[PDB]
Design a protein around this ligand. Structure first.
Ligand SMILES: CC[C@H]1OC(=O)[C@@](C)(F)C(=O)[C@H](C)[C@@H](O[C@@H]2O[C@H](C)C[C@H](N(C)C)[C@H]2O)[C@](C)(OC)C[C@@H](C)C(=O)[C@H](C)[C@H]2N(CCCCn3cc(-c4cccc(N)c4)nn3)C(=O)O[C@]12C
Ligand SMILES: [K+]
Ligand SMILES: [Mg+2]
Ligand SMILES: [Mg+2]
Ligand SMILES: [Mg+2]
Ligand SMILES: [Mg+2]
Ligand SMILES: [Mg+2]
Ligand SMILES: [Mg+2]
Ligand SMILES: [Mg+2]
Ligand SMILES: [Mg+2]
Ligand SMILES: [Mg+2]
Ligand SMILES: [Mg+2]
Ligand SMILES: [Mg+2]
Ligand SMILES: [Mg+2]
Ligand SMILES: [Mg+2]
Ligand SMILES: [Mg+2]
Ligand SMILES: [Mg+2]
Ligand SMILES: [Mg+2]
Ligand SMILES: [Zn+2]
Lengths: 122, 215, 37, 160
RNA sequence: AUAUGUUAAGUGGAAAAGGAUGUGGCGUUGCC
RNA sequence: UUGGCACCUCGAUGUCGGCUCAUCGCAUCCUGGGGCUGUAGUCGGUCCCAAGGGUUGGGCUGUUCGCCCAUUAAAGCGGUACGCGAGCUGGGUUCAGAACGUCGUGAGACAGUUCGGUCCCUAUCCGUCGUGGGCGUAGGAAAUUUGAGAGGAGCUGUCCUU
RNA sequence: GGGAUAAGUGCUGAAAGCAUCUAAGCAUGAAGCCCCCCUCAAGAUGAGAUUUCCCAACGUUAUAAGAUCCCUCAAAG
C-alpha cells in the first residue's frame, strides 16, 4: 500500500538506495499502489558511482510490500519491507541485478526481466 | 423465470474448480408453497404468491405472530397448505407453469444461474452524516470546532431555505436492497440450501428473495 | 458549414434557399455551404 | 403549375393503380380533383404547390407501374465486394464486419462482378431510399473515390 | 359582436448593425 | 471586473482566504453526434448540436490569483450576500504593545514593513433530515399488492484482435 | 436495448417547366429527452385492487374477526 511520500528501498544495483514516491500512476484520483504497479519517484539516497543519482525523478515498479497481496486461491503473501525497482519505458530494469525476493505477480505484470534476475520469486 | 424465498443463514467459503476461493452465502429455502395465482383477468397483473416457513396453526388466545390468525389460515387453506411466516409475490416468473398449493423446491435453480437477491439491509439506528452519507470530517486539530457536523446546509438570502434532499442525520439501514447478477454456486436438495456467490443484504435469519436476474 | 448572421452567395453557383425557417446557401463547393444563425 | 398543367394501367381513384408491375396506391392531396388529369382549385399559393406535387406523384405512379425504376450503385476500391446472400445484399467495404442490407417488398437486388449493385422496384421513393442507404453504408471519399457511389454521380477529388 | 383586410412568427407576449426567392399592396420600365 | 450613482440597512445587513456541504447557468474542459478543412494516415484547426455524468495530488505564498513539480479523458468559465462563521477556522485585514524606513518642530503619522494580539448564543416559527400519534378512505379486520407521482443511477482509461 | 428528437444527412417533391432535404409526404440521426435498471409511493381526500376472516340485542351494555395494555426479549431501537 504505497502512496505519495512513501519511502521505498530499491532492490537493484542501479545506484538508487531509497526513493520517495511522487505519484501513483494509472488514473485520476488513484491514491495507493501495490506490487506490480508503477510509481514516479525521486531518489533521496544513492550510492556512489551508480547510474541513477540522488535528486533524479525516475519510474519504478513495486516488487514487494508490507501490505502484500491476496491471490485468487485465498492465499496471501506479505513481506517485511517495501521495495521497488527502477525501470525504463520498456519495463526493463535500469540496474543489472535484483536483490531479495519478489512477488510472482510481476510475471502477470510482464516484468519478465526483473522476474528472471530475482533470486527468488514467491 | 424463477423465484424462491429463504432465510440467510450466514457466510462461508468454498473451493471452486482450479482451487479459487469463492465466498458464499448460505440460504435455507425450505417450505416454499404457491398460495395464490394472480391474473390479469382478476387482479390486473400476472404474479404468483409464494408463502415460506410454515407457522403454527390458529389457536384461541394466541398472543404472537407464531400462530396464524383466522384470515391467514383461511388464505392458506384455500391453497391446502400450512400457514406461512413470509408471503411474497413474484411477477418475473410465468404463472402458467405453477399450480396453487405446489411446492417451490430449491431444485428450481441450477449451479451457474445468474440471480438477483433482495433483502432488508441491516439496521443501524440514528446515524450522523459521516457514517450515513459518507461525508468528510472537519479538521481534528488546528483549533477546529468542526469534527462530525454535516457542514453548510444551504446558501444565503438566495434561497433563504434548505432544499429538499439535503443529506442530514437520521435513521440508517433497514432499507430494501437488491444486489444484482450474483451466481448460484451450489444447490443442495437435502437441507434445502442454495449457496449464493458473494454476500446479500440483511442480518442472519433475515428473509431474502431470490429471482432470476433481470439483466 | 458556415453559421453566420450574414449569409450570401459567394460565387455564381451559390443558391439561396429556405429550409425549416432558416436561410441557407447551398453550392457545388462545400466550403460555400452556409446557414443563418 | 407548368408541371401541374396513361396506359393500360387502372388509374382507378385517393388513387390505386393495378398496373403490370404492381398496384402502388396512395392518397394524393384532398383538394385537387381529376378528370387522367389533375385540376387546381382556388389558384392559391398552396393550391398551386399541391397541384404540382400531386401531378408529379401521379406521373411517378404511372411510370413505376408501367416500367419500374432502377438505381445503380458502383463500388470503387481494392477488395470492395457486394454479394447476394439469398435475397439480401452483403457489402465488404473495408469494415471489420460485413454489412447486411435487407431486401424489401416491391424491391429487388442484383450484383455484377460483386461490384455494381442495382435496385429495382415499382416505387420511385422506395428505390431512392434503398439506393441512398446502400450509399450511406460507405459514401465516396474525396482522396481516392473509394466507396459505394451512384453510377452516374460526379465525385469531387482532392489531391494528397 | 358586425364588415373588410394582414400575420403563421404563439409574431402578438422585451433589442441593433446587417442578412434573406417569407408574404400583402402600390407602382416604373425590358422581352414576348 | 474597475468604476459612476447614493435608493434599503449606521437603536449593527461580520470583511479576505481556506474547511464542510452543495446548488444552478452554458459562452463545453473531457466524453457523445455532426459540417468545413490549406482533412492522405496518425494527429490537428474551426464552427454547429449537446449540461448526462465526470472534471487532481503536491512545492511557494494569508492569500484569491499566479508560477512550478507530477499526473489525468479532462484538470472549463461563471451565478448563488465575490454561496456557506446562530456550520468551523482566524493566516490576512478597521484595535490597545513594540521596532525599522520615511514624513512631521512636536504630539504623532504611513502608495510602507515587522513580531504579538479574547470568534458569544440552551433553536420559538418557516425550512430540512428522521420518527410516532389522530382522523379520513360509507361495515370492521389480516395479509398480499397496482403504480399517479417522486427520488436514485448516468463517468471513463489501458491493452489484445480486426 | 426500445421509442421520439437536436445539429446533421437524405429520399420523393412542387411552388419556380429546371434545380431544390420541405411546402405537403417518407426516412435516418447524439453520453442528451421518455422508458428500460434500483428505491419510495393510494393523505393518489382521485384516499385504488386481490385473497381470506368476522356477524346483537336494548346513544347504552356486552362483544366478533382483530388488536393492544402488561410481561420475557433482539435480527429492531
Ligand atoms: C464571550 C462572551 C462575550 O461575547 C463576546 O465577547 C463575543 C465573542 F460574543 C463578541 O465579541 C461579540 C460578537 C461582540 O459583538 C459584535 O460587536 C461588533 C462591534 C459588531 C458585531 N456585528 C454587529 C457586526 C457584533 O456581533 C460583542 C461586542 O462582544 C464584545 C457583543 C456585546 C453584546 C458584548 O459586549 C457582550 C456582552 C460580550 N461581553 C463583553 C466581552 C468583553 C471582552 N471579554 C471579557 C471577557 C471575560 C470577562 C469575565 C471573565 C472572563 N473569563 C472573560 N471575555 N471577553 C461579555 O461579557 O459577554 C459577551 C457575550
Ligand atoms: K387506501
Ligand atoms: Mg479531510
Ligand atoms: Mg474537538
Ligand atoms: Mg462577412
Ligand atoms: Mg414573444
Ligand atoms: Mg457595482
Ligand atoms: Mg439625490
Ligand atoms: Mg450600517
Ligand atoms: Mg434592529
Ligand atoms: Mg450551446
Ligand atoms: Mg517542507
Ligand atoms: Mg461570500
Ligand atoms: Mg450564516
Ligand atoms: Mg501603538
Ligand atoms: Mg525628524
Ligand atoms: Mg507566535
Ligand atoms: Mg411512475
Ligand atoms: Zn458557391
Amino acid at each position: 500500500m504505497i502512496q505519495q511520500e512513501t519511502r521505498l528501498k530499491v532492490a537493484d544495483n542501479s545506484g538508487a538506495r531509497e526513493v520517495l514516491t511522487i505519484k501513483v500512476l494509472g488514473g485520476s484520483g488513484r491514491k495507493t499502489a501495490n506490487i506490480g504497479d508503477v510509481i514516479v519517484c525521486t531518489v533521496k539516497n544513492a550510492t556512489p558511482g551508480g547510474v541513477v543519482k540522488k535528486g533524479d525523478v525516475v519510474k519504478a515498479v513495486i516488487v514487494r510490500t508490507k501490505s502484500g497481496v491476496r491471490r485468487n486461491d485465498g492465499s496471501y503473501i506479505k513481506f517485511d519491507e517495501n521495495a521497488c525497482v527502477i525501470i525504463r519505458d520498456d519495463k526493463g530494469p535500469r540496474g543489472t541485478r535484483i536483490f531479495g525476493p519478489v512477488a510472482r505477480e510481476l510475471r502477470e505484470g510482464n516484468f519478465m526481466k526483473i522476474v528472471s534476475l530475482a533470486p527468488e520469486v514467491l | 423465470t424463477k423465484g424462491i424465498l429463504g432465510r440467510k443463514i450466514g457466510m462461508t467459503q468454498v473451493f471452486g474448480e482450479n482451487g479459487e476461493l469463492i465466498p458464499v452465502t448460505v440460504v435455507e429455502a425450505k417450505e416454499n408453497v404457491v398460495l395464490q395465482k394472480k391474473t390479469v383477468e382478476v387482479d390486473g397483473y400476472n404474479a404468483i404468491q409464494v408463502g415460506f416457513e410454515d407457522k403454527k396453526a390458529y389457536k384461541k388466545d394466541a398472543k404472537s405472530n407464531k400462530y396464524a390468525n383466522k384470515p391467514a389460515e383461511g388464505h392458506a387453506k384455500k391453497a391446502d397448505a400450512a400457514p406461512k411466516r413470509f408471503i411474497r409475490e413474484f411477477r418475473n416468473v410465468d404463472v402458467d407453469a405453477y399450480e396453487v398449493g405446489q411446492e417451490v423446491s430449491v431444485d428450481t435453480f441450477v449451479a451457474g444461474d445468474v440471480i438477483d437477491v433482495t433483502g432488508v439491509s441491516k439496521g443501524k439506528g440514528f446515524q450522523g452524516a459521516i457514517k450515513r452519507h459518507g461525508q468528510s470530517r472537519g479538521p481534528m486539530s488546528h483549533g477546529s470546532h468542526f469534527h462530525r457536523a454535516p457542514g453548510s446546509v444551504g446558501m444565503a438570502s438566495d434561497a433563504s431555505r434548505v432544499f429538499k434532499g439535503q443529506k442530514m442525520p437520521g435513521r440508517m439501514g433497514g432499507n430494501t436492497v437488491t444486489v444484482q447478477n450474483l451466481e448460484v454456486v451450489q444447490v443442495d436438495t437435502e437441507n434445502k440450501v442454495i449457496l449464493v456467490k458473494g454476500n446479500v443484504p440483511g442480518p442472519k435469519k433475515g428473509l431474502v428473495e431470490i429471482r432470476t436476474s433481470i439483466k | 458549414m458556415k453559421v453566420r448572421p450574414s449569409v450570401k452567395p459567394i460565387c455564381e453557383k451559390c443558391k439561396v434557399i429556405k429550409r425549416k425557417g432558416k436561410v441557407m446557401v447551398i453550392c457545388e463547393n462545400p466550403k460555400h455551404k452556409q446557414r443563418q444563425g | 403549375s407548368r408541371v401541374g398543367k396513361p396506359s393500360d394501367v387502372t388509374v382507378t381513384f385517393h388513387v390505386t393503380v393495378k398496373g403490370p408491375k404492381g398496384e402502388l396506391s396512395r392518397t394524393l392531396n384532398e383538394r385537387m380533383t381529376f378528370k387522367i388529369e389533375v385540376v387546381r382549385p382556388s389558384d392559391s399559393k398552396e393550391d398551386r404547390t399541391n397541384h404540382g406535387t400531386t401531378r408529379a406523384l401521379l406521373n411517378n405512379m404511372v411510370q413505376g407501374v408501367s416500367q419500374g425504376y432502377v438505381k445503380v450503385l458502383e463500388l470503387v476500391g481494392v477488395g470492395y465486394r457486394a454479394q447476394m446472400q439469398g435475397k439480401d445484399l452483403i457489402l465488404n467495404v473495408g469494415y471489420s464486419h460485413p454489412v447486411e442490407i435487407k431486401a424489401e417488398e416491391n424491391i429487388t437486388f442484383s450484383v455484377e462482378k460483386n461490384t455494381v449493385v442495382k435496385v429495382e422496384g415499382i416505387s420511385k421513393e422506395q428505390v431512392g431510399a434503398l439506393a441512398s442507404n446502400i450509399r450511406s453504408v460507405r459514401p465516396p471519399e474525396p482522396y481516392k473515390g473509394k466507396g459505394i457511389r451512384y453510377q452516374g454521380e460526379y465525385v469531387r477529388r482532392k489531391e494528397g
